[PDB]
Amino acid sequence: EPQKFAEELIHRLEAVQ
Amino acid sequence: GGSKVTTVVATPGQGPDRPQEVSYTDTKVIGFGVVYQAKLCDSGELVAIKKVLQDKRFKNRELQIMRKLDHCNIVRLRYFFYSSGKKDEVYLNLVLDYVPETVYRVARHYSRAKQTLPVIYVKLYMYQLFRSLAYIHSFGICHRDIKPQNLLLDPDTAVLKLCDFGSAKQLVRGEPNVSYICSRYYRAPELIFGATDYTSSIDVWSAGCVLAELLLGQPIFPGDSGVDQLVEIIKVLGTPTREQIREMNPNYTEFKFPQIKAHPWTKVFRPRTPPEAIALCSRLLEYTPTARLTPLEACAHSFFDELRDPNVKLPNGRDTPALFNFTTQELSSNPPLATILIPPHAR
Ligand SMILES: CC[C@@]1(c2ccccc2)C2=C(CC(C)(C)CC2=O)Nc2n[nH]cc21
Secondary structure (H helix, E strand, C coil), rough: HHHHHHHHHHHHHHHCC | CCCEEEEEEEECCCCCCCCEEEEEEEEEECCCCCCEEEEECCCCCEEEEEEEECCCCCCCCHHHCCCCCCCCCCCCCEEEEEEHHHHHHHHEEEECCCEEEEEHHHHHHHHHHHHHCCCCHHHHHHHHHHHHHHHHCCEEECCCCHHHEEEECCCCCCCEECCCHCCEEECCCCCCCCCCCCCHCCCCCCHHHHCCCCCHHHHHHHHHHHHHHHHHCCCCCCCHHHHHHHHHHHHHHHHHHCCHHHCCCCCCCCCCCCCCCCCHHHHCCCCCCCCCHHHHHHHHCCHHHHHHHHHHHHHHHHHHHHHCCCCCCCCCCCCCCCCCCCHHHHHHHHHHHHHHHHCCCCC
């Protein structure tokens, strides 16, 4: 369950980097 | 009822359970339960009545929390009583003090005028909020829904009262709790990461969000969703370190997150924002939950020094509300802080 959340977060942060 | 008088056998919210007849009139629906406004016949005082379905096999969690509390900055449970519905249906009715305004409504007045709440009110409101949090936290009770909408405000006296304990719970170390709690803008980051072993410091994060919002004129972390909430936090504070993440939830060790630099903390707020307000905000909005100030430490912060000035007065020419009637319960996390908290002129 962390795996699903973290993968989503990593993509959203790459969209702002 | 509407213009009928309703008489019920109701238990006073404090003291032993000895119910007595209570009469009220003028019921009007205000808004998972139903909330009414009413008037007590004996005194004419306005009350709010929260009515929720209650199964007979267990005691209402909110009711059991409310009956423990007696504090000038927490909405008073005047009475509670039970009423009926569907076959064998029973409603619990919580009779609470009615306060006409909230911090949400008052702050929204300044936002629409494109203006900022004068900082004396920020000090007064946040100080009373931190007092209420110190009090409830001393019982192990976490409110879990701190937000401007749950901060009752008497604009004439500047008294603030914490309300809506429907999300509150006694936190016990070792017993899991639900992570999707708190209103999104005010939700602590460890909850967003899905922690179930969190503590009362989630309320301190929420209070930090309230303080930032009062200084800014709008929510500081307006997330579109749970994940976007964290993205908004990161855009201001920068990416949490691997260490801070472990302190929030220890289940993210196989992940490396993109590194976003923190915004310059002073540039977050308007140019003339008092530096002590910014310093207090930075010690509330900490990723690591144990790094946050306790509510009692927040009360003692330098930002509230003006409230301890013997010559301080409200902008309406009235005296400040009660600020120093601390109890042993309220002081229990750090009793020596009373040396700062209670000024000599208040003894
Ligand atoms: C009557 C219910 C109310 C409330 C209930 C839950 C959260 C916050 C406030 C409430 C108001 C005034 C209001 C904000 C205009 C409408 C409203 O919901 N005053 C109160 N005093 N005690 C409880 C309340």
